[PDB]
Amino acid sequence: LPEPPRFVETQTVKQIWTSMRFASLTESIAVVCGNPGVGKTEAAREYRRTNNNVWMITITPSCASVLECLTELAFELGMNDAPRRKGPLSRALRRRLEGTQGLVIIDEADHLGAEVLEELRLLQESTRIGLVLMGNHRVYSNMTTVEFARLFSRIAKRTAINKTKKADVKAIADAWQINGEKELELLQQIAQKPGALRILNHSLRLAAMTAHGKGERVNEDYLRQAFRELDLDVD
Amino acid sequence: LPEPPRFVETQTVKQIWTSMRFASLTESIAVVCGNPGVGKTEAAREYRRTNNNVWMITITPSCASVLECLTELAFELGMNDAPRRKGPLSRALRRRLEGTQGLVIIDEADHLGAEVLEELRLLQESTRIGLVLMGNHRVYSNMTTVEFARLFSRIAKRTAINKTKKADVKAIADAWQINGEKELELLQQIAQKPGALRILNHSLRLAAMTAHGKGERVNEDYLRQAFRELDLDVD
Amino acid sequence: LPEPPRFVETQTVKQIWTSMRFASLTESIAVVCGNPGVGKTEAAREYRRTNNNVWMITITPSCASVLECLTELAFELGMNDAPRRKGPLSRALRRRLEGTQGLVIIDEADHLGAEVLEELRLLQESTRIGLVLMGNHRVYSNMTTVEFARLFSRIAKRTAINKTKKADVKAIADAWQINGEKELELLQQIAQKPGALRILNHSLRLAAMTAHGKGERVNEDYLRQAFRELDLDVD
Amino acid sequence: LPEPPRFVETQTVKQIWTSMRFASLTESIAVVCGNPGVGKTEAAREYRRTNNNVWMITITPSCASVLECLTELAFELGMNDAPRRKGPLSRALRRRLEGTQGLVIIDEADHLGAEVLEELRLLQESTRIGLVLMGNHRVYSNMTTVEFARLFSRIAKRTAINKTKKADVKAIADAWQINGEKELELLQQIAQKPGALRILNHSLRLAAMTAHGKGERVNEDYLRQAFRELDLDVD
Ligand SMILES: Nc1ncnc2c1ncn2[C@@H]1O[C@H](COP(=O)(O)OP(=O)(O)O)[C@@H](O)[C@H]1O
Ligand SMILES: Nc1ncnc2c1ncn2[C@@H]1O[C@H](COP(=O)(O)OP(=O)(O)O)[C@@H](O)[C@H]1O
Ligand SMILES: Nc1ncnc2c1ncn2[C@@H]1O[C@H](COP(=O)(O)OP(=O)(O)O)[C@@H](O)[C@H]1O
Ligand SMILES: Nc1ncnc2c1ncn2[C@@H]1O[C@H](COP(=O)(O)OP(=O)(O)O)[C@@H](O)[C@H]1O
């Protein structure tokens, strides 16, 4: 019956915002490698929505060149007059982006070319801004250090989020007005399976729409039917 | 609680500024080869901010041609009407840059092509200006002298900065208002590990943000937790 | 303490042998598509060991041509003088294999080329022998019928084995001298997870070697530690 | 003064032999991913020296094809008449190796091609033998499962050895006749640094040769000078 809230502040959200503002004021590189679906991508957008001098792209592996990725960052900076060459684009980024005290956020940092991440790190370095890397744990695996040596020299704050915590789903249940202890344990058990935030949010939205269609309150059995869907135990 | 200082004058900063002004008034070549993250890059920018007729580029290995690097120096000179050919660009640099009594600073001089550094040395020579090389100790290793013979004849003041000194981190503690002798020894021990200035700055900024978030003073335990992060003993 | 038995007769083994002898006497094609690790590959070898005029290859996708696969069947027939051309090999198979009333078994029938399975079906047809296909459920998916039309007309007895049964693991516990009902339920729960026969056999062999190294009987806790290994809930 | 012993039974050696004999009797695949220099390679050779029906290759990335690697295994089987084609070699391995109840050991399993490890797993499977994979933790990273899906279904006993234990270096000190508790703590501290078994063995051999050249007993100061060598804190 109430409106579903899309985003909730969580222990991971608190942690990752402190890491984000750390790389902001620190003006240095923060790598966030974690399990898939730990909710990192969404929080970054909440940081972008709440804070000034913040930018974010995503990297599809289609846009995984230096040219394409810097073009993406340039259009995110609003310079629609960006040149299609590498060089003058790099110069335009260097003139535009330095002195703003900003924070660049990059998602899926595993698909970075060495020249790609190289130009990014030398950019923020030659720009006095923030760069923050996201994605899975292949990002730190791509460094483990003569090709990534000076880059490993400046990793300010890595923060690994493997899975959720109990206060994480507890604040989730607080935001979704969930009071059952059986409900809380079931939410925790759902959080034990991967795609944690995504599956939990899906399960929450299935139960909310089912209880709204039946005119009832979200309860434990709606959550059981929701989790009984999705083919999680079906190969 | 106070504002963090962005830059601190240091014994290396004193040394390297004297080398920088030496190559300036001397109008000759100074190679600064050191360990990675000795803080040389940052000081160069303080020299650029404090002094007139000073320019600086960075060299990504993307921009490692003669054409690209001279284009970078040209846009740093503000000649946005620079030609995309090598020749007329070299002529425009020769007319623009001679007679100003300036100082060109070049970072990461290890990725120089022989024609690249060749055109740079013949430039400053035919320009009555200063050139200063930065980077790791591969720059002097690329010369050790019939291809680099007259260039090794040019060299005015090499200054090797391997690691920090104790007065270095002492002036750091003076700038960061640090009075603990246990704190001073811990800062020195952090300076013994590579990425010296970078890790120390990271550690200083971690402790400052943690003590500001907890409302307290930066103390030894915040420094221990900061250094306990970053995976320095983790492979 | 007793000798571990490598193979046990099972409800799937009974079913699949009846399908195998059916395609034998019927001299027609039987496709066995199932989930991975349903134990089909091993049983086929028990059929090969117990029965005369039985042959079996495996198909690695390295050997997935008509030439390579028929060469494999030829060396399985013991004709080491087989020609390296397609044609005379096909003739040698046609002369050797017809009149023996045999049964060809082919594993991993999903990696069949259309010409590959085409030559196989026209072989057995022009040979008065048996062909039996194995593998996952992509084999029937590759037919779902103008390129596979007459082949879908040959189909004699498909038998899909998705997962195990309770009498399956019951005869497993009879062969492994397992009498605990808690043990039986735990074996069933292990059979609910994929790689059923393989994981169960691994678990049985872990518990047997652990109880033999500790001088004890296989019990429930050894099975729990065995299943606690293998990273089944670890991504 | 006594003879140095090269190999000592250790907790990792006990663990890894139990995993090795497990994959032997189990006739299934055991992946041993660990940190570099955890001493796994040597123990494998002790298993090869002590046990019958055991074979081992190494994989240089020069020999990283299916053809080259199977050729290596064939020459390890003593069939010097092995064919230089893939197919008849695979057939010769299939006829030679099945029925012996053997154990193949493969080192550096990270450099496996998909067809390479594919032919190996289908080999042991079509051979009723043992395969055991070694190397760093990139082997399990290359699987994390539709290209490696049935292979991840094969996996019997992974054993990760990150670093040593205290009983490990304790049995080392027992084999090397080391009784000092200061000596024991120093050996443990050396074991905390990577290249554990190798550096410790190097340190042991430096101290043994120095004390033999000086006519004395190995003591703590010889160990300190040995560890003071090797440039472990020098970049
Ligand atoms: N605080 C939150 N509240 C609700 N859903 C969240 C929250 N944080 C993340 N999510 C969910 O996580 C997903 C977005 O991030 P996600 O895709 O998990 O990132 P990544 O795949 O990079 O780990 C969506 O399902 C989103 O609803
Ligand atoms: N005087 C200084 N005060 C504060 N930080 C400094 C100072 N000198 C260097 N740094 C730090 O060093 C880095 C910039 O130079 P650096 O990257 O170490 O140069 P290089 O890699 O070429 O040796 C940044 O982390 C910067 O904060
Ligand atoms: N009757 C049986 N008794 C014991 N183990 C069996 C039995 N049948 C199959 N297995 C096990 O199953 C595997 C053989 O079949 P498998 O290769 O899994 O078939 P597929 O992967 O083609 O479905 C081996 O692990 C083997 O030990
Ligand atoms: N039991 C042991 N006692 C002494 N040294 C050992 C022992 N086991 C292994 N080593 C040492 O380990 C090395 C051989 O294995 P290693 O190179 O560490 O394997 P990997 O590189 O695959 O981890 C040699 O330095 C060898 O002396």
Coordinates of N, CA and C in Angstrom, one line a residue, chain D residues 110-200:
Chain D
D110 N 47.4 -22.8 -14.8 CA 46.8 -21.5 -15.2 C 47.0 -21.3 -16.7
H111 N 48.0 -21.9 -17.3 CA 48.3 -21.7 -18.7 C 47.6 -22.7 -19.6
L112 N 46.5 -23.3 -19.1 CA 45.8 -24.3 -19.9 C 44.9 -23.6 -20.9
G113 N 45.0 -24.0 -22.1 CA 43.9 -23.7 -23.1 C 42.7 -24.4 -22.7
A114 N 41.5 -23.9 -23.2 CA 40.2 -24.5 -23.0 C 40.2 -25.9 -23.6
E115 N 40.7 -26.0 -24.8 CA 40.8 -27.3 -25.5 C 41.8 -28.2 -24.8
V116 N 42.9 -27.5 -24.2 CA 43.9 -28.3 -23.5 C 43.4 -29.0 -22.3
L117 N 42.9 -28.2 -21.3 CA 42.3 -28.8 -20.1 C 41.0 -29.6 -20.5
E118 N 40.3 -29.2 -21.6 CA 39.2 -30.0 -22.1 C 39.6 -31.4 -22.5
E119 N 40.7 -31.5 -23.2 CA 41.1 -32.9 -23.6 C 41.7 -33.6 -22.5
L120 N 42.3 -32.9 -21.5 CA 42.8 -33.6 -20.3 C 41.6 -34.1 -19.4
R121 N 40.6 -33.3 -19.2 CA 39.5 -33.8 -18.4 C 38.7 -34.9 -19.1
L122 N 38.5 -34.8 -20.4 CA 37.9 -35.9 -21.1 C 38.8 -37.1 -21.2
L123 N 40.1 -36.9 -21.2 CA 41.0 -38.0 -21.1 C 40.8 -38.8 -19.9
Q124 N 41.1 -38.2 -18.7 CA 41.1 -38.9 -17.4 C 39.7 -39.6 -17.3
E125 N 38.7 -38.8 -17.8 CA 37.3 -39.4 -17.7 C 37.2 -40.6 -18.5
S126 N 37.8 -40.6 -19.7 CA 37.7 -41.7 -20.7 C 38.9 -42.6 -20.4
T127 N 39.5 -42.6 -19.2 CA 40.7 -43.3 -18.9 C 40.7 -44.0 -17.6
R128 N 39.8 -43.6 -16.7 CA 39.7 -44.1 -15.3 C 41.0 -44.0 -14.6
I129 N 41.5 -42.8 -14.5 CA 42.8 -42.4 -13.9 C 42.6 -41.2 -13.1
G130 N 43.7 -40.6 -12.6 CA 43.6 -39.4 -11.9 C 44.3 -38.2 -12.6
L131 N 43.7 -37.1 -12.5 CA 44.3 -35.8 -12.9 C 44.3 -34.9 -11.7
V132 N 45.4 -34.1 -11.6 CA 45.5 -33.2 -10.5 C 46.1 -31.9 -11.0
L133 N 45.5 -30.8 -10.8 CA 45.9 -29.5 -11.3 C 46.7 -28.7 -10.2
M134 N 47.7 -28.0 -10.5 CA 48.5 -27.2 -9.6 C 48.5 -25.7 -10.0
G135 N 49.3 -24.9 -9.3 CA 49.6 -23.6 -9.8 C 49.0 -22.5 -8.9
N136 N 48.9 -21.3 -9.4 CA 48.4 -20.1 -8.6 C 46.9 -20.1 -8.7
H137 N 46.4 -19.0 -8.0 CA 44.9 -18.9 -7.9 C 44.2 -18.4 -9.2
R138 N 45.0 -18.3 -10.3 CA 44.3 -17.9 -11.5 C 43.6 -19.1 -12.2
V139 N 43.9 -20.3 -11.7 CA 43.3 -21.5 -12.3 C 41.8 -21.5 -11.9
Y140 N 41.4 -21.3 -10.7 CA 40.0 -21.2 -10.3 C 39.4 -19.9 -10.8
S141 N 40.2 -18.9 -11.0 CA 39.7 -17.6 -11.6 C 39.4 -17.7 -13.1
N142 N 40.0 -18.7 -13.8 CA 39.7 -18.9 -15.2 C 38.3 -19.6 -15.4
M143 N 37.8 -20.1 -14.3 CA 36.4 -20.7 -14.4 C 35.4 -19.8 -13.8
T144 N 35.7 -18.8 -13.0 CA 34.8 -17.9 -12.4 C 35.2 -16.5 -12.7
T145 N 31.3 -20.5 -16.6 CA 30.7 -21.8 -16.2 C 29.5 -22.1 -17.1
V146 N 29.7 -21.9 -18.4 CA 29.2 -22.8 -19.5 C 30.3 -23.4 -20.3
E147 N 31.5 -22.7 -20.4 CA 32.6 -23.3 -21.0 C 33.4 -24.2 -20.1
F148 N 33.3 -23.9 -18.8 CA 33.9 -24.7 -17.7 C 32.9 -25.4 -16.8
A149 N 31.7 -25.6 -17.3 CA 30.5 -25.9 -16.5 C 30.6 -27.4 -16.0
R150 N 30.8 -28.3 -16.9 CA 30.9 -29.7 -16.6 C 32.2 -30.0 -15.9
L151 N 33.2 -29.1 -16.1 CA 34.5 -29.2 -15.4 C 34.4 -28.8 -14.0
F152 N 33.7 -27.7 -13.7 CA 33.3 -27.3 -12.3 C 32.4 -28.3 -11.7
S153 N 31.7 -29.1 -12.5 CA 31.0 -30.3 -12.0 C 31.9 -31.4 -11.7
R154 N 33.1 -31.5 -12.3 CA 34.0 -32.6 -12.0 C 34.7 -32.5 -10.7
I155 N 34.9 -31.3 -10.2 CA 35.9 -31.0 -9.2 C 35.7 -31.7 -7.9
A156 N 36.7 -32.5 -7.5 CA 36.6 -33.3 -6.3 C 37.1 -32.7 -5.0
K157 N 38.3 -32.2 -5.0 CA 38.9 -31.6 -3.8 C 39.8 -30.5 -4.2
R158 N 39.3 -29.3 -4.2 CA 40.2 -28.2 -4.2 C 40.9 -28.0 -2.8
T159 N 42.1 -27.7 -2.8 CA 42.9 -27.3 -1.6 C 43.7 -26.1 -1.8
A160 N 43.3 -25.0 -1.2 CA 44.0 -23.7 -1.3 C 45.1 -23.6 -0.2
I161 N 46.3 -23.5 -0.6 CA 47.4 -23.2 0.4 C 47.9 -21.8 0.1
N162 N 47.4 -20.9 1.0 CA 47.8 -19.5 0.9 C 49.3 -19.3 1.4
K163 N 49.5 -19.6 2.7 CA 50.8 -19.5 3.2 C 51.0 -20.7 4.2
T164 N 52.1 -20.7 4.8 CA 52.5 -21.8 5.7 C 51.8 -21.8 7.0
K165 N 52.1 -22.8 7.8 CA 51.6 -22.8 9.2 C 52.8 -22.8 10.1
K166 N 52.4 -22.8 11.4 CA 53.5 -22.8 12.4 C 54.0 -24.2 12.6
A167 N 53.2 -25.2 12.5 CA 53.7 -26.6 12.6 C 54.5 -27.0 11.4
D168 N 54.2 -26.3 10.2 CA 55.0 -26.4 9.0 C 56.4 -26.1 9.3
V169 N 56.7 -24.8 9.7 CA 58.1 -24.4 10.0 C 58.6 -25.1 11.3
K170 N 57.7 -25.6 12.1 CA 58.2 -26.4 13.3 C 58.8 -27.7 12.9
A171 N 58.1 -28.4 12.0 CA 58.7 -29.6 11.4 C 59.9 -29.3 10.6
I172 N 59.9 -28.2 9.9 CA 61.1 -27.7 9.2 C 62.3 -27.6 10.2
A173 N 62.1 -27.0 11.4 CA 63.1 -26.8 12.4 C 63.5 -28.1 13.0
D174 N 62.5 -29.1 13.1 CA 62.8 -30.4 13.5 C 63.7 -31.2 12.5
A175 N 63.5 -31.0 11.2 CA 64.3 -31.7 10.2 C 65.7 -31.0 10.1
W176 N 65.8 -29.7 10.3 CA 67.0 -29.0 10.2 C 67.7 -28.9 11.6
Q177 N 67.2 -29.6 12.6 CA 67.8 -29.7 14.0 C 68.0 -28.3 14.6
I178 N 66.9 -27.5 14.6 CA 66.9 -26.1 15.0 C 66.1 -26.1 16.3
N179 N 66.7 -25.6 17.4 CA 66.2 -25.7 18.7 C 65.9 -24.3 19.4
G180 N 66.5 -23.2 18.8 CA 66.3 -21.9 19.4 C 64.9 -21.4 19.2
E181 N 64.3 -20.8 20.3 CA 63.0 -20.2 20.2 C 63.1 -18.9 19.5
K182 N 64.2 -18.1 19.7 CA 64.4 -17.0 18.9 C 64.6 -17.4 17.4
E183 N 65.3 -18.5 17.2 CA 65.5 -19.1 15.9 C 64.1 -19.5 15.3
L184 N 63.3 -20.0 16.1 CA 61.9 -20.5 15.6 C 61.1 -19.3 15.2
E185 N 61.1 -18.2 16.1 CA 60.4 -17.0 15.7 C 60.9 -16.3 14.5
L186 N 62.2 -16.3 14.3 CA 62.8 -15.7 13.1 C 62.4 -16.5 11.9
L187 N 62.4 -17.9 12.0 CA 62.0 -18.7 10.9 C 60.5 -18.5 10.5
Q188 N 59.7 -18.3 11.5 CA 58.3 -17.9 11.3 C 58.2 -16.6 10.6
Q189 N 59.0 -15.6 11.0 CA 58.9 -14.3 10.4 C 59.4 -14.3 8.9
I190 N 60.3 -15.2 8.7 CA 60.7 -15.4 7.3 C 59.6 -16.1 6.5
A191 N 58.9 -17.0 7.2 CA 57.8 -17.7 6.5 C 56.6 -16.7 6.3
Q192 N 56.6 -15.6 7.0 CA 55.5 -14.6 6.7 C 55.8 -13.8 5.4
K193 N 57.0 -13.9 4.9 CA 57.2 -13.2 3.6 C 57.1 -14.2 2.4
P194 N 56.7 -13.7 1.3 CA 56.4 -14.6 0.2 C 57.6 -15.3 -0.4
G195 N 57.4 -16.3 -1.3 CA 58.4 -17.2 -1.6 C 58.8 -18.0 -0.3
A196 N 57.8 -18.2 0.5 CA 58.0 -18.8 1.9 C 59.0 -20.0 1.9
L197 N 58.5 -21.1 1.3 CA 59.4 -22.3 1.4 C 60.7 -22.0 0.7
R198 N 60.7 -21.3 -0.4 CA 61.9 -21.1 -1.2 C 62.9 -20.2 -0.4
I199 N 62.4 -19.1 0.2 CA 63.3 -18.1 0.9 C 63.8 -18.9 2.1
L200 N 62.9 -19.6 2.8 CA 63.3 -20.3 4.0 C 64.4 -21.3 3.7

